Scaffold this active site. Structure first.
Site, PDB file in Angstrom:
ATOM      1  N   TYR D  26       0.834  -1.191   0.000  1.00  0.00           N
ATOM      2  CA  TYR D  26       0.000   0.000   0.000  1.00  0.00           C
ATOM      3  C   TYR D  26       0.872   1.245   0.000  1.00  0.00           C
ATOM      4  O   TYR D  26       2.015   1.228   0.462  1.00  0.00           O
ATOM      5  CB  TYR D  26      -0.940   0.025   1.213  1.00  0.00           C
ATOM      6  CG  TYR D  26      -0.235   0.270   2.528  1.00  0.00           C
ATOM      7  CD1 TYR D  26       0.323  -0.780   3.244  1.00  0.00           C
ATOM      8  CD2 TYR D  26      -0.131   1.549   3.058  1.00  0.00           C
ATOM      9  CE1 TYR D  26       0.969  -0.562   4.445  1.00  0.00           C
ATOM     10  CE2 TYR D  26       0.513   1.777   4.255  1.00  0.00           C
ATOM     11  CZ  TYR D  26       1.060   0.718   4.945  1.00  0.00           C
ATOM     12  OH  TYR D  26       1.700   0.942   6.141  1.00  0.00           O
ATOM     13  N   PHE D  36       2.285   9.989   2.955  1.00  0.00           N
ATOM     14  CA  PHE D  36       2.603   9.919   4.376  1.00  0.00           C
ATOM     15  C   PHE D  36       3.077   8.530   4.784  1.00  0.00           C
ATOM     16  O   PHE D  36       3.714   8.373   5.831  1.00  0.00           O
ATOM     17  CB  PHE D  36       1.389  10.351   5.208  1.00  0.00           C
ATOM     18  CG  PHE D  36       0.227   9.394   5.149  1.00  0.00           C
ATOM     19  CD1 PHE D  36      -0.835   9.633   4.292  1.00  0.00           C
ATOM     20  CD2 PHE D  36       0.169   8.289   5.983  1.00  0.00           C
ATOM     21  CE1 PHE D  36      -1.909   8.767   4.240  1.00  0.00           C
ATOM     22  CE2 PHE D  36      -0.904   7.421   5.934  1.00  0.00           C
ATOM     23  CZ  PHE D  36      -1.944   7.661   5.063  1.00  0.00           C
ATOM     24  N   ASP D  37       2.779   7.512   3.979  1.00  0.00           N
ATOM     25  CA  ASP D  37       3.176   6.149   4.295  1.00  0.00           C
ATOM     26  C   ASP D  37       3.250   5.331   3.015  1.00  0.00           C
ATOM     27  O   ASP D  37       2.566   5.624   2.030  1.00  0.00           O
ATOM     28  CB  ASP D  37       2.203   5.491   5.280  1.00  0.00           C
ATOM     29  CG  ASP D  37       2.789   4.263   5.944  1.00  0.00           C
ATOM     30  OD1 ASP D  37       4.023   4.084   5.883  1.00  0.00           O
ATOM     31  OD2 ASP D  37       2.016   3.476   6.529  1.00  0.00           O
ATOM     32  N   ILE D  56      -7.163   0.493  10.277  1.00  0.00           N
ATOM     33  CA  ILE D  56      -8.281   1.421  10.213  1.00  0.00           C
ATOM     34  C   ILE D  56      -9.433   0.794   9.436  1.00  0.00           C
ATOM     35  O   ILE D  56      -9.240  -0.090   8.590  1.00  0.00           O
ATOM     36  CB  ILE D  56      -7.841   2.755   9.587  1.00  0.00           C
ATOM     37  CG1 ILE D  56      -7.068   2.509   8.292  1.00  0.00           C
ATOM     38  CG2 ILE D  56      -6.997   3.548  10.570  1.00  0.00           C
ATOM     39  CD1 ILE D  56      -6.640   3.778   7.590  1.00  0.00           C
ATOM     40  N   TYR D  82      -9.039   7.696  11.346  1.00  0.00           N
ATOM     41  CA  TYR D  82      -8.439   8.483  12.424  1.00  0.00           C
ATOM     42  C   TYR D  82      -9.356   9.578  12.958  1.00  0.00           C
ATOM     43  O   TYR D  82      -8.974  10.258  13.920  1.00  0.00           O
ATOM     44  CB  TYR D  82      -7.100   9.112  12.010  1.00  0.00           C
ATOM     45  CG  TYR D  82      -5.966   8.115  11.968  1.00  0.00           C
ATOM     46  CD1 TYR D  82      -5.648   7.353  13.084  1.00  0.00           C
ATOM     47  CD2 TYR D  82      -5.223   7.924  10.811  1.00  0.00           C
ATOM     48  CE1 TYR D  82      -4.618   6.436  13.052  1.00  0.00           C
ATOM     49  CE2 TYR D  82      -4.191   7.007  10.770  1.00  0.00           C
ATOM     50  CZ  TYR D  82      -3.893   6.267  11.895  1.00  0.00           C
ATOM     51  OH  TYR D  82      -2.866   5.352  11.864  1.00  0.00           O
ATOM     52  N   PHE D  99      -5.444   5.540  -0.480  1.00  0.00           N
ATOM     53  CA  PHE D  99      -4.543   4.397  -0.442  1.00  0.00           C
ATOM     54  C   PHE D  99      -4.535   3.700  -1.793  1.00  0.00           C
ATOM     55  O   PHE D  99      -5.596   3.462  -2.377  1.00  0.00           O
ATOM     56  CB  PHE D  99      -4.955   3.404   0.649  1.00  0.00           C
ATOM     57  CG  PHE D  99      -4.784   3.929   2.041  1.00  0.00           C
ATOM     58  CD1 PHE D  99      -3.541   3.929   2.650  1.00  0.00           C
ATOM     59  CD2 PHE D  99      -5.871   4.414   2.747  1.00  0.00           C
ATOM     60  CE1 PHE D  99      -3.385   4.412   3.933  1.00  0.00           C
ATOM     61  CE2 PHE D  99      -5.720   4.895   4.032  1.00  0.00           C
ATOM     62  CZ  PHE D  99      -4.476   4.895   4.625  1.00  0.00           C
TER      63      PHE D  99
END
Lengths: 592, 434, 186, 107, 263
Positions: D26, D36-37, D56, D82, D99
């Site tokens: 991902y 961010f990731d 999540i 979140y 994502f």
């Protein structure tokens, strides 16, 4: 190079390439410009694409003065011509914009009232064309970051526009979107009376609705017919295009009208709920200019193009990956290669201090902050910064320190703190330990051998932000230690060889920038104990081959080193002595 | 003056105060580095003794009182309105000298920096003012580096004000240094300050410069330059195809770039305009290129999702047919013979258009330009002409880089200056009038 | 260079003299190297004297007297291992009534007008210990109870005989040879 | 609360079942486009279990809807991603997450 | 002519550097000379290492590893300032230390690792933080003092090691005397436990240490308790609550094992 001109510059990196050096230049003692270099010299060329930069204080034509807003007035940024009415002055259109954009909403929803002001997302700025400046020569509106069009003759019909038409299966146009980089109006057509006004200067008011993307213009208190609808998330820069026909051309009035927020509320997040207009020092007037350089990349993509056959056409094939590290300026919505900071001093210094702050916030085992920082600075970026040879020295040192602090500092500090204690379990491998490897009294290589003393346990947590578990916060984030070890060995092997040549091209610009970060990382890994057997043998040969021959290339200990490098070499020797002491203690315990 | 007495009757010793402030700054000036060690240490001893005597006599509170009583006036014009014009001339200078004197009094003296903790809260309340920001920041930096007690009283509001100073005033490395000093003091980490600074600065990604690892993107184009103008013998309706022989979705951690479409030149120069000649920008990343990647329509660096039968990113054995209509500005695509439900329309037609493909590593594509330059897999739509028909008679069609520099040896690299406009692309026969 | 580093560290202003392992080791090394040790011949005794003079010259030619004065001055009258090593080094370089070392020490003090040196000497004299009947009686009771002392030393009575003797031997060596100038200076 | 587009098709006939681990690559982006990731950066495939409250809810439901071998784009509205508190130092409050997830294997 | 040894190589290299250049960095000079002294003082390395050397059986290796991890967390808390999370971590680590069997079976290892010293610097930090502003994080000091008293009760040598730090504890005897539910968890309690039932340590007790407690008792008898009158208690002239605690410390100082230490 002039029009239709082709030339080549040879810096004499390879002397054989030079054709007349021996005929004239070898005997006279002149040296090739690239004689003591290991990598190609970075070449900078004039930038074709104009960019917006802050108006210099020494600009001979444009002057910008900041007029503070009084109780009865509003803050104003005034643009005036320094050399109007004199000889050799320049009389072409000059493009201006404000330094900060207004960002529209991510999703477009389908006296003054204080509640309305608190809940609204409409922002306003106005531009006053001074009486005497010809208004058809002045354009007011918004531009995006994509605007780079420097045309001597500008008009609203030559703006870059496109209409993305999306349709259904049979062909019904369910939506059409116009896209452009210039949303501006002309004061000449904006005037209702027109011609020359002398009651007061023309007040062109620009209104932006960040929640709907509607751009509306007000001229002298009435609504103009021109309107623009922009896409969601569009960033709009206030902009004025004007041709100077007066010593005073125009000014940016940052006031507000009924039921609307001032421009500062939209610009700055801290002032999102402040109806009082403001002009913070960050906001400043920028102008389009051609005085900028461009850094030619050291390496390009390898692309193979050929005609396979008449039927098969032309084949274009690229297979080798190539990457660069991009620095993004948030306020300007502009990105540059980080290698261009070798000539951008302010950005380089600010980014070095940003890296220092990144290290400070996670200093001394703040594992939660380390996991947070792993999002902003990830391991491909860290590896690229570590290995890159064209990185500036300050950025290289900062990135080495950040890599050490985020992933390695905690375990290194723990294992250093647990160093002067020798808790030796009494097992069979402990009993097998002896002072000397064999029958003769010859010291083995320090660190090499069987060590049984109890040592802290090394554990790491995978930095994933989709998981919702809080157990990850304990333990430092994971990093590829085998890859880091191999890369460190390879780079030290290169650096030792390149140091002996005493070239004029060290990585980072100085011998200190070349060696201090790399040796610091090596020392950290050595303390952590990742190195094992063959890696230790190779890196001891690198330090000093003759003493550590397996059982005369100048090692690190004899290369006419700077004092900062000498201190780290002393640290490495201290660690080796500590390893010898630990081996002695273990052998004594075995005999006992 | 505050109680509004007559300005002339009030004795305001501006000149003497300024000269005394300069003398005091000279008196508290730190020793220079080039001095010998013993002399430098003696001067440091004298400076520390002077600072201790001043703090014991309470001269720091007097400076604070002067600063507070001078901040009642917003600006130099306001001070010149209330007091004399000559006083308003040097109001700013007196404030700067007072802040420098405070910094000199407290610098390097841990006792003074510890006793300044009580007034530290009063100091930060005026950090936003432009006339005192630098002096207040310097005093804050000295207090933070010397006194661990100040880090105990620095709160979330103070940290947020210091952070908002970056947002309002711009990128200043001294604010970053102050933030670093707030984290670790004398080898002791402050977990609360670290957490607050991280949580209040990092997530925004709007002040600090952002870094990301980006793949290089290159562009390849044929020789043909086709455009539209009045009275020009040029067909306005063209067609060509692209075949993807192989593509790796992830050659690196970043997704592979592969976009195809048309691009335009600024004016009549053969030179691709509006984009960077190297970087990570491809077709559709400027308002001069018009690209299709299989799922999106790219123009001006903005992507819009377009529907297609079994829509998917470009894979192996995918044929993209590009249609350009200059009579009515229109760019249409068809994937694998199926019409892509999207169009670029009403774009600038002043320049010259050419086929273009943008890619990163892991790409094997073939241009099908018609005739003896690749055989079309599908029928061109009626009216549209194959792109190979646009080649000039003597010129030979070849696929070359869109930009003028490639990977090669540096001394063999050809450096090119500006070249002539390509006006010969459009043949407008202009005879003399009779 | 080592002696210069030690002198600069002492000359740096600090609230207290920090215990330095490097100083307390190298001062011991230098002190031992000084004198470096039945009827002997006159030539042999004179030869020993000349060897001692050379070995003391190796130190005081590089600034050892000034360093041992500076360390005592920076001690600020606090008894410690640093002062114990400094006094031993001073004794080692001053053995035999070394007139050159005495002159160097007096000239340095006169030139720098060092008051801290004499103040620290007075403080160290005051801090010196004497016989303690209370401690002796407590230790005797502890032994008579039959139980073995936790530490084998038991040197609470007359705490630092070696330090007191070293201080006063240093002060005596400073005046040996009827050195009138420094006798009056004291 | 989760919208899904398919970037590349999958087999289309195998889907995650109850208590079956999902191996995914991902890449996480905000709406503005900032990354961010990314599991591909760490080069370490991500493994999680359906119905074990490990990730999540948006990622959970997106992976549930995805089939084996399918590359899909997942947009998670903030309530399932979140919420309003966000993730300290990474995710701003009330932030929509996007994502790009590929279901490598099911086990 | 080749060095053939790390010691010889270092000894040659340091001297060569020093005689080649005048080193401007005092840190570099200090490091080079420390390393040279280590090369020439090979005995000193063993002399310093052997007191820090402890051997254990193979059965307790994992338990010793857990205890060492706990102690490492304890020591790492020394480089950060106090907060609620630090208090939680230290309390959990101390609980683990007592739950550990090695803490009982090997008091010598615990004394060699410098555990009681580390707990004492943690207590020093918490007590020095806002000492005039009243003690913050009181359960923290309570856990540290309970741990130190248990360390005293473990063994006599541990008791002597704590008795070696008696002067500081009497300096900070006035931490939490007035506050109840802190009985048995104060630096004065640690001081009392450092001398409790040890006749040798009672004899080794000095006069200034007793005088400090006597002056504290005089202060408590002359002046009331400010914290107690702040909570509304009637303002009597003296401080019985603190007076009793100083009195019981004096009781432990003067009385040992059923007899009276006359000195």
């Amino acid at each position: 190079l002039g029009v239709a001109q082709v030339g080549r510059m040879n810096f004499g990196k390879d002397v054989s390439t030079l054709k007349y050096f021996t005929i004239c230049g070898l005997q006279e003692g002149y040296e090739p410009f690239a004689v003591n270099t290991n990598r190609d010299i970075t070449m900078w060329l004039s930038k074709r694409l104009p960019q917006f930069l802050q108006v210099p204080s020494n600009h001979e034509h444009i002057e910008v003065t900041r007029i503070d807003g009084t109780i009865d007035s509003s803050p104003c940024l005034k643009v005036t011509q320094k050399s109007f009415g004199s000889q050799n002055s320049n009389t072409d259109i000059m493009f201006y914009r404000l330094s900060m954009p207004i960002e529209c909403a991510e999703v477009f929803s389908k006296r003054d009232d204080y509640d309305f002001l608190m809940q609204t997302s409409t922002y306003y700025y106005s531009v006053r064309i001074f009486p005497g400046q010809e208004p058809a020569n002045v354009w007011v509106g918004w531009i995006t970051s994509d605007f780079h069009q420097y045309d001597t003759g500008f008009d609203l019909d030559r703006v870059r526009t496109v209409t993305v038409t999306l349709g259904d299966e049979k062909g019904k146009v369910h939506e059409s979107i116009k896209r452009s980089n210039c949303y501006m109006v002309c004061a000449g057509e904006s005037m209702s009376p027109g011609q020359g006004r002398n009651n007061n200067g023309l007040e062109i008011g620009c209104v932006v609705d960040a929640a709907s993307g509607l751009l509306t213009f007000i001229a002298n208190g009435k609504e103009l017919s021109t309107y623009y609808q922009v896409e969601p998330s569009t960033k709009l820069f206030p902009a004025v295009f004007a041709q100077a026909t007066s010593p005073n051309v125009f000014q940016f009035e940052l006031g507000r009208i009924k039921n609307v927020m001032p421009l500062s509320a939209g610009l700055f997040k801290s002032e999102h709920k402040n109806p009082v207009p403001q002009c913070p020092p960050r906001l400043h007037v920028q102008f389009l200019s051609h005085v900028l350089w461009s850094r030619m990349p050291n390496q390009f993509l390898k692309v193979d193009v050929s005609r396979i056959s008449e039927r098969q056409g032309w084949l274009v094939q690229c297979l080798d990956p190539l990457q660069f590290m991009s620095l993004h300026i948030p306020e300007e919505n502009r990105s540059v290669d980080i290698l261009e900071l070798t000539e951008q001093e302010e950005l380089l210094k600010f980014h070095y201090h940003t890296l220092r702050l990144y290290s400070a916030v996670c200093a001394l085992g703040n594992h939660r902050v380390a996991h947070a920082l792993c999002s902003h600075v990830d391991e491909p970026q860290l590896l690229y910064a570590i290995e890159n040879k064209y990185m500036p020295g300050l950025l290289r040192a900062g990135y080495y320190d950040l890599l050490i602090d985020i992933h390695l500092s905690s375990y290194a500090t723990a294992r250093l703190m647990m160093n002067n204690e020798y808790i030796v379990p009494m097992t069979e491998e402990t009993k097998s330990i002896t002072l000397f490897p064999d029958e003769n009294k010859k010291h083995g290589l320090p660190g090499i051998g069987l060590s049984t003393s109890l040592r802290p346990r090394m554990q790491f947590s995978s930095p994933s932000f989709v998981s919702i578990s809080n157990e990850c916060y304990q333990y430092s984030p994971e990093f590829p230690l085998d890859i880091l070890k191999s890369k460190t060995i390879q780079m030290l092997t290169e650096a030792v060889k390149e140091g002996s040549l005493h070239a004029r091209d060290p990585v980072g610009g100085t011998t200190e920038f070349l060696f201090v970060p790399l040796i610091k990382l090596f020392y950290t890994l050595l303390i952590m104990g990742i190195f094992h057997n063959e890696d230790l043998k190779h890196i001891l040969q690198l330090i000093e081959p003759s003493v550590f021959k397996e059982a005369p290339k100048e090692g690190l200990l004899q290369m006419k080193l700077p004092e900062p490098v000498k201190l780290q070499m002393c640290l490495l020797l201290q660690y080796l002595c500590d390893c010898q002491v630990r081996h002695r203690i273990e052998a004594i315990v075995a005999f006992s | 003056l505050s109680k509004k007495a007559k300005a002339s009757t009030v004795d305001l010793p501006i000149e003497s105060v300024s000269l005394s402030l300069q003398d005091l700054i000279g008196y508290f000036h730190p020793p220079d580095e080039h001095l010998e060690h013993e002399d430098k240490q003696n001067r440091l001893r004298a400076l520390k003794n002077r600072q201790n005597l001043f703090q014991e006599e309470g001269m720091i509170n007097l400076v604070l009182e002067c600063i507070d009583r001078l901040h009642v006036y917003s600006s130099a014009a306001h001070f010149a309105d209330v007091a004399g014009r000559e006083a308003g001339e040097s109001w700013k200078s007196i404030l700067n000298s007072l802040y420098e004197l405070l910094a000199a009094l407290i610098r390097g003296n841990r006792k003074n920096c510890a006793q300044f903790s009580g007034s530290l809260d009063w100091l930060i309340s005026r950090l936003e003012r432009l006339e005192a920001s630098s002096g207040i920041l310097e005093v804050l930096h000295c207090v933070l580096v010397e006194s661990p007690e100040a880090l105990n009283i620095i709160k979330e509001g103070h940290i947020k004000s210091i952070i908002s100073l970056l947002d309002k005033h711009g990128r200043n490395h001294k604010v970053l240094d102050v933030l670093c000093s707030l984290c670790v003091c004398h080898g002791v980490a402050v977990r609360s300050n670290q957490h607050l600074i991280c949580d209040n600065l990092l997530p925004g990604r709007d002040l600090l410069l952002q870094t990301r690892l980006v793949n290089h993107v290159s562009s390849m184009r044929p020789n043909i330059f086709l455009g539209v103008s009045e009275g020009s013998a040029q067909y306005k309706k063209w067609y060509y195809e692209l075949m993807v022989d192989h593509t790796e979705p992830f050659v690196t951690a970043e997704a592979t770039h592969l976009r195809v479409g048309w691009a335009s030149t600024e004016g009549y120069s053969p030179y691709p305009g509006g984009g960077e000649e190297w970087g990570g920008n491809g077709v559709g990343d400027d308002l001069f290129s018009y690209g299709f990647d299989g799922l999106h329509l790219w123009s001006g660096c903005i992507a819009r999702t377009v529907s297609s039968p079994n829509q998917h990113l470009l894979r192996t054995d995918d044929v993209i047919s590009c249609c350009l209509d200059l009579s009515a500005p229109s760019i249409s695509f068809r994937i694998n013979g199926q019409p892509v439900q999207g169009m670029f329309e009403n774009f600038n037609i002043d320049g010259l258009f050419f086929p273009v493909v943008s890619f990163s590593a892991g790409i094997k594509v073939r241009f099908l330009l018609g005739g003896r330059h690749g055989e079309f897999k599908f029928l061109p739509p009626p009216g549209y002409a194959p792109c190979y028909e646009a080649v000039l008679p003597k010129e030979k069609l070849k696929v070359e880089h869109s930009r003028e520099y490639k990977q090669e040896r540096t001394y063999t690299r050809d450096l090119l200056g500006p070249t002539v406009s390509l006006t010969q692309a459009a043949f407008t026969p202009i005879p003399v009038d009779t | 260079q080592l002696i210069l580093l030690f002198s600069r560290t002492a000359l740096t202003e600090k609230c207290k003299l920090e215990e330095d392992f490097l100083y307390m080791a190298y001062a011991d090394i230098m002190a031992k190297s000084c004198h470096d040790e039945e009827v002997k011949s006159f030539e042999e005794k004179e030869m020993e004297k000349q060897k001692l003079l050379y070995q003391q010259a190796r130190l005081h030619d590089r600034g050892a007297a000034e360093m041992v004065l500076q360390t005592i001055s920076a001690s600020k009258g606090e008894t410690g291992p640093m002062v114990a090593a400094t006094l031993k080094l001073g004794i080692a370089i001053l053995n035999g009534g070394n007139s050159t070392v005495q002159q160097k020490m007096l000239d340095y003090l006169k030139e720098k007008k060092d008051v801290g040196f004499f103040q620290s000497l007075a403080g160290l004299m005051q801090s010196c210990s004497v016989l303690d009947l209370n401690a002796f009686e407590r230790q005797n009771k502890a032994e008579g109870l039959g139980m073995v002392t936790e530490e084998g030393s038991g040197e609470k009575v007359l705490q630092d005989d070696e330090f007191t003797c070293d201080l006063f031997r240093f002060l005596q060596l400073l005046c040996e040879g009827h050195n009138s100038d420094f006798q009056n200076y004291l | 609360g989760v919208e899904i587009e398919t970037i590349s098709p999958g087999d289309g006939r195998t889907f995650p079942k109850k208590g079956q681990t999902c191996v995914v690559h991902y890449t996480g982006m905000l709406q503005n486009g900032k990354k961010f990731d990314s599991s591909r950066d760490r080069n370490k495939p991500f493994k999680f279990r359906i119905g074990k409250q490990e990730v999540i809810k948006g990622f959970e439901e997106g992976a549930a809807q995805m089939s084996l071998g399918q590359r899909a784009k997942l947009t998670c509205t903030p309530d399932v991603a979140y919420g309003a508190t966000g993730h300290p130092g990474v995710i701003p409050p009330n932030a929509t997450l996007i994502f790009d997830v590929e279901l490598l294997n099911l086990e | 002519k080749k060095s053939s040894t790390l010691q010889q190589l270092i000894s040659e290299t340091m001297v060569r550097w020093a005689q080649e250049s005048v080193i401007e960095d005092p840190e570099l000079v200090r490091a080079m000379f420390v390393l040279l002294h280590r090369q020439y003082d090979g005995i000193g390395g063993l002399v310093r290492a052997l007191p820090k050397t402890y051997t254990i059986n193979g059965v307790s290796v994992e338990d010793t590893i857990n205890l060492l991890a706990s102690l490492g967390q304890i020591r790492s808390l020394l480089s950060v300032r106090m907060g609620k999370e630090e208090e939680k971590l230290m309390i959990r680590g101390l609980g683990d230390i007592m739950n550990n069997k090695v803490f009982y079976q090997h008091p010598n290892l615990m004394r060699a690792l410098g555990m009681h010293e580390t707990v004492m610097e943690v207590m020093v930090n918490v007590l020095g933080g806002g000492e005039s502003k009243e003690i913050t994080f009181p359960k923290m000091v309570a856990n540290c003092c309970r741990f130190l008293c248990y360390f005293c009760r473990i063994s006599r040598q541990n008791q002597k090691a704590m008795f070696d730090h008696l002067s500081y504890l009497l300096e900070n005897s006035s931490v939490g005397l007035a506050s109840p539910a802190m009985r048995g968890s104060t630096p004065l309690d640690v001081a009392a436990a450092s001398v409790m039932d040890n006749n040798e340590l009672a004899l080794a007790l000095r006069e200034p240490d007793l005088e400090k407690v006597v002056r504290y008792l005089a202060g408590c008898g002359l002046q009331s308790c400010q914290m107690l009158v702040s909570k509304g208690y009637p303002d009597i002239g003296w401080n019985p609550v603190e007076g009793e605690r100083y009195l019981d410390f004096l009781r432990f100082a003067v009385f040992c094992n059923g007899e009276s230490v006359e000195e």
